[PDB]
């Protein structure tokens, strides 16, 4: 069984401005098998209204998914994406950095 670990990017759909409505994305790619656990976090707490793209894959057969929810950034609030996959001994957390 091949085990390819997911690559993770966490970022906004639109330019991020404190106080202004936006969408938070977590893009997971390059992984195999397809089963994966992705949550978006607000100050460490799981966000409930999270949707995701339909499962697809690249030429090398590795899967990719976009998970997304509506959010309003602020100076204080911390956002992150938490990923678990068979390849990961522990869940990987990637912080949202507005410059990234």
């Amino acid at each position: 069984m091949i085990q390819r670990t997911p690559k993770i990017q966490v970022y906004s759909r639109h330019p991020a401005e404190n106080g202004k409505s936006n969408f938070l994305n977590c893009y997971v790619s390059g992984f195999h098998p397809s089963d994966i656990e992705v949550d978006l976090l607000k100050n460490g707490e799981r966000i409930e209204k999270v949707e995701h793209s339909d499962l697809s894959f690249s030429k090398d057969w590795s899967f990719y998914l976009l998970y997304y929810t509506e959010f309003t950034p602020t100076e204080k609030d911390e956002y992150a994406c938490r990923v678990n996959h068979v390849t990961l001994s522990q869940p990987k957390i990637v912080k949202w950095d507005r410059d990234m």
């Binding site: 069984m1 091949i2 390819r4 690559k7 990017q9 970022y11 759909r13 639109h14 330019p15 969408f23 994305n25 893009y27 790619s29 195999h32 098998p33 397809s34 089963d35 793209s53 339909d54 499962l55 697809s56 894959f57 057969w61 590795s62 899967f63 976009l66 997304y68 410059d99």
Partner: protein
Amino acid sequence: GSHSMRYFFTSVSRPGRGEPRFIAVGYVDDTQFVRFDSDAASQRMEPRAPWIEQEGPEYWDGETRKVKAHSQTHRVDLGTLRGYYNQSEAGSHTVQRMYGCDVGSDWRFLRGYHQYAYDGKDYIALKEDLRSWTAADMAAQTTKHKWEAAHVAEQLRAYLEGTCVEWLRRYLENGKETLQRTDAPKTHMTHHAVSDHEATLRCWALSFYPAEITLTWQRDGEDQTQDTELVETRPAGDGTFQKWVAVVVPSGQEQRYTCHVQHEGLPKPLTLRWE
């Protein structure tokens, strides 16, 4: 420019109870336009772009029929492959198939594709001429012989050169407002001082379509790859794409560094500088 239609199918066996999870998606270029998900309530092929909703009941009944048949083929395949590879009934396994056609600027057939993988590894694929097969191992070789005897390649070629391009052309016209539109990247540069000696310049491309793009750095007019980082192109979630490239520079020398942007939606390459 050139265009493509591709379909992607993933089946994942569920040992212990019931049929595989089956997910099918269809794209024109970088735009998804249909899906089927065995776990969804409708058990229909469903629209995922506005321009496919123009298609009538007969379209949707046909696509549903075929895609359900597809899920059954993969279900059978999963059992066969387990036997080929002498695997237990216990584990979960995956079959993936992708096929489609490319047309050039004349919207005429350029290339066709039909490939298959088992557990994320190449299994069998049609060769570029659409007349023979590449089989990765002896299991796939047995499939190759079976498909040769059944003249599968001939019928696949007929679809890829015929129906595939004919319907791609149809979709391109019906979806012209978005499918034939190029969205040039919206570009800007940011600056961050890591210390009083070293700074990061980040060159952004946002809101572009299609996804294909090149972002590069030059220093004094020569390509610079050292001390650079380039993220994978990523979906914005509104149909467009995002990318950035960064370079680490000596603080105060930002002016030497220029970002270069190439994209279908730009008549000529773009050059950006820090200010």
